[PDB]
């Protein structure tokens, strides 16, 4: 009977494959074959933030596109004011193995988690004026790879136990559990409307969930190795994934298929970070060869290089207004490019 | 004016945070974190001395942080990269399915990893008494066919002197690890193998000496002497 179920699943996968093949009629490159190229744009290191001791695993921009938060393996969480290159709120962490950090949309809270299998929520503004652990969430049996604030009262986390969880910060309990990933989830990205979110895991698959009840609407399988980073298109109808097979891919919703892959022959290092520009024309991908490649998302031709680091980048982000891009690195340096 | 006022307030807050941060840097520099890794749960990592476990111990007024992985899945492909900056990886192997082959494969994967290529390994061979009991009693020979051709090295220095067969087996296992260590990498990181009987307190001294040698080699590499 197990063999019968395996045959049933294989037949269903084949049927989905034929449905996708019938859906595809013309590649995205053919559509954007007459589009004027970007023009080989170059961006210099506008600023360098150098307050961390150990490698920087994650950083997240604020809503105002002025304040950012960075987490480093020296157990440090620093909120930089990028305009005046100043720093505020150097938050010490209970566990020094933080691997992710998030900034609340309202700007009132900061999340961080790591090898402790726990997500700590810190209240930025207090009557005492000192940042303290507002709440500790521990519903994960594996390391927290990513976390994102939903509405300043709910948080979505992905862990190394192959599960995602939507929490309630007030009650400190798991509200919803998203399951279906084989490999541990490495990254997640919220939709602009906060109605859906995509998650990329250690398997080649990426799954799209809806936070209201979380039943894994769609699954995309185009990569060949672990999906390290995921980012969501500004219009909300597409997303981009970066994997360890040294390729980036652009999937789209409501078509359940690949659109275009970004890769080069002389690239043999995996992707660690992926982000989109304000209009979505540019796709910024961080690499393991200490460089950041800026791709024309419509033509899959390299448009820029951002080689300002000494070690792997491991994190990058673009401001809400698209003014500047911040890249962290394992050399304990943050760089703001514009 | 508001703008100079808030700029001054932000600058003084930055100065205070800078003071606290240099104070924290002083503590962080003199710590020498280590990663205590074991092939399986059978290995007696605990007596060597959720999510992650911390152990603080001082040797000759030198602080040491040992991190033991707890509530994590068996797939260590991703989170092991968090330990590329540790001073050493204390790899504990029970020298008593073929668990030895699994330990060898794990050691090879750790040694040949791209991000751990600069991290040194302190190899501990536990279950020495168990290995002696198994060797004297009438599974090592069949698991490793090359053991028959193996001969005890000249610098065996068998201090316990329990048998000329136990020493041969333990040195065969040590050479099995050293083959990978020497072949895969040269001039970047070093492997320090030791025999432990799990009833001795000298393990922390051996770890201290190996860490001293590791940092000496790292400093020597700055001048390209090594």
């Amino acid at each position, epitope marked *: 009977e197990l063999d019968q179920l395996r045959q049933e699943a294989e037949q269903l996968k084949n049927q989905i494959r034929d449905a996708r093949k019938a859906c595809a009629d013309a590649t995205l490159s053919q559509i954007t074959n007459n589009i004027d190229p970007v023009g080989r744009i170059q961006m210099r290191t506008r600023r360098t933030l150098r307050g961390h001791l150990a490698k920087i695993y994650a950083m997240h921009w604020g809503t105002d596109s002025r304040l950012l938060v960075s987490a480093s393996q020296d157990g440090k969480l620093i909120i930089w004011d990028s305009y005046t290159t100043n720093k505020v709120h150097a938050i010490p962490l209970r566990s020094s193995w933080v691997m992710t950090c998030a900034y609340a949309p309202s700007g009132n809270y900061v999340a961080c988690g790591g090898l402790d299998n726990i997500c700590s929520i810190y209240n930025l503004k207090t009557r005492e004026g000192n940042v303290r652990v507002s709440r500790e969430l521990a519903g994960h049996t594996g390391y927290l790879s990513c976390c994102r604030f939903l509405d300043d009262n709910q948080i979505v986390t992905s862990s190394g136990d192959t599960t995602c969880a939507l929490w309630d910060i007030e009650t400190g309990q798991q509200t919803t559990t998203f399951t279906g990933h084989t490999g541990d989830v490495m990254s997640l990205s919220l939709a602009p409307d906060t109605r859906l979110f995509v998650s990329g895991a250690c*398997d080649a698959s990426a799954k799209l969930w809806d936070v209201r009840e979380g039943m894994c609407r769609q699954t995309f399988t185009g990569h060949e*190795s672990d999906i390290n980073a995921i980012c969501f298109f500004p219009n909300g109808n597409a997303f981009a994934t970066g994997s360890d*097979d040294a390729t980036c891919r652009l999937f789209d919703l409501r078509a359940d298929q690949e659109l275009m892959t970004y890769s080069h022959d002389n690239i043999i290092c995996g992707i660690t970070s992926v982000s989109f520009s304000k209009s979505g024309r540019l796709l910024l991908a961080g690499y393991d060869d200490f460089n950041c490649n800026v791709w024309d998302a419509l033509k899959a031709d390299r448009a820029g290089v951002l080689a300002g680091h000494d070690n792997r980048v491991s994190c990058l982000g673009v401001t809400d207004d698209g003014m500047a891009v911040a890249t962290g690195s394992w050399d304990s340096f943050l760089k703001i490019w514009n | 004016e508001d703008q100079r006022n808030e700029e001054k307030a932000q600058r003084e807050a930055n100065k205070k945070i800078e003071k606290q941060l240099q104070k924290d840097k002083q503590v962080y520099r003199a710590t020498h974190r280590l990663l205590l890794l074991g092939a399986g749960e059978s290995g007696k990592n605990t007596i060597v001395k959720s999510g992650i476990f911390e152990t603080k111990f001082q040797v000759d007024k030198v602080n040491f942080h040992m991190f033991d992985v707890g509530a994590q899945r068996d797939e260590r492909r991703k989170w092991i990269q968090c330990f590329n900056d540790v001073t050493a990886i204390i790899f504990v192997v029970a020298s008593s399915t073929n668990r030895l082959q699994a330990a060898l494969k794990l050691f090879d994967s750790i040694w040949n990893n791209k991000w751990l290529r600069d991290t040194s390994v302190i190899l501990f061979l536990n279950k020495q008494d168990l290995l002696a009991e198994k060797v004297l009693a009438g599974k090592i020979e069949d698991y490793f066919p090359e053991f028959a051709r193996y001969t005890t090295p000249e610098d065996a220095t068998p201090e316990p002197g329990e048998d000329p067969r136990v020493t041969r087996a333990k040195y065969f296992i040590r050479d099995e690890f050293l083959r990978i260590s020497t072949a895969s990498g040269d001039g970047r990181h070093y492997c320090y193998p030791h025999f432990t009987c799990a009833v001795d307190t000298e393990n922390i001294r051996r770890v201290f000496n190996d860490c001293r040698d590791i940092i000496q080699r790292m400093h020597l590499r700055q001048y390209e002497l090594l």
Partner: nanobody
Amino acid sequence: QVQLQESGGGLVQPGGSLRLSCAASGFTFSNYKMNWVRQAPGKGLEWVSDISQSGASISYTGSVKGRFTISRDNAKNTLYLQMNSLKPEDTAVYYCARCPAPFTRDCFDVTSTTYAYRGQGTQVTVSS
């Protein structure tokens, strides 16, 4: 998607010969190092052998060193394991595993349970 399908191997008399063929799809075969692992009844996954890209770095576990041989055809996108002298204690489910990262001399967690880039496996039983 990454799909590894193993074929061959049934009931074989002790001392007999067998051939296991692993067909791979969804990735560039030549970029990855391949592995053969096995799981005995009630024993857990154990590593049997591995071969690097384009061969030339073959290695086996000690138990099967003199008997089993592993080869690969990059053009045919296939992995082969020949078992020329079977013994009763190697009755197991055999899996074709593809290591997680391309262009890597190291590769992790093939023997770990719930591993993504592993096939369904074939039963190989040796008995009278």
